[PDB]
Write a protein that binds this ligand. Structure first.
Ligand SMILES: C[C@@H]1O[C@@H](O[C@@H]2[C@@H](O[C@H]3O[C@H](CO)[C@H](O)[C@H](O)[C@H]3O)[C@@H](O)[C@@H](CO)O[C@H]2O)[C@@H](O)[C@H](O)[C@@H]1O
Ligand SMILES: [Ca+2]
Length: 128
């Protein structure tokens, strides 16, 4: 069921999990919760998500609580500004340290509590 896009395969889960249990599942399939590094990747992801909410690889790192990608793609604050839902990340209840794709729009991301269960998206490189 992996879907192909620009050199990567993507798994849109059928079972919901917490952010970390989702990441573990991804790692057990030689992948990671997905990073997003271009408008075209954001578009592919939210369109395929079809209006449902999916964990992606957004999580906090460092003392500052800077956003980061679990697959170790460097997080680009400037280039990623356009990808958040206006008002996010809002850190609601001061307990939102993971990120999902929520709205079917380029402005898609929301921060939400890591212990909440959602469907999730894994990303796995194709290596010829
Ligand atoms: C359920 C909850 O929804 C969001 O937090 C809401 C918040 O949502 C609005 O405002 C934020 C910025 O604070 C964003 O612009 C959203 O797009 C808006 O919909 C507000 O409704 C306030 C009002 O008291 O409540 C918050 O809980 C979201 O950020 C949370 O993660 C969570 O999903
Ligand atoms: Ca939020």
């Amino acid at each position: 069921g992996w879907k192909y896009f620009k050199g990567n395969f993507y798994y849109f889960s059928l079972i919901p999990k917490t952010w970390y249990s989702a990441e573990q599942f991804c790692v057990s399939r030689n992948s990671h919760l997905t990073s997003v590094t271009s408008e075209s990747e954001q578009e592919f992801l939210y369109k395929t998500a079809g209006g449902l909410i999916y964990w992606i690889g957004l999580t906090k790192a460092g003392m500052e609580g800077d956003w980061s990608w679990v697959d170790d793609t460097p997080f680009n604050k400037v280039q990623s500004a356009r990808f958040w839902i206006p008002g996010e990340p809002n850190n609601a209840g001061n307990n939102e340290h993971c990120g999902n794709i929520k709205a079917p729009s380029l402005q898609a991301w929301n921060d939400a509590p890591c212990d909440k269960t959602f469907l999730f998206i894994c990303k796995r490189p194709y290596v010829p």
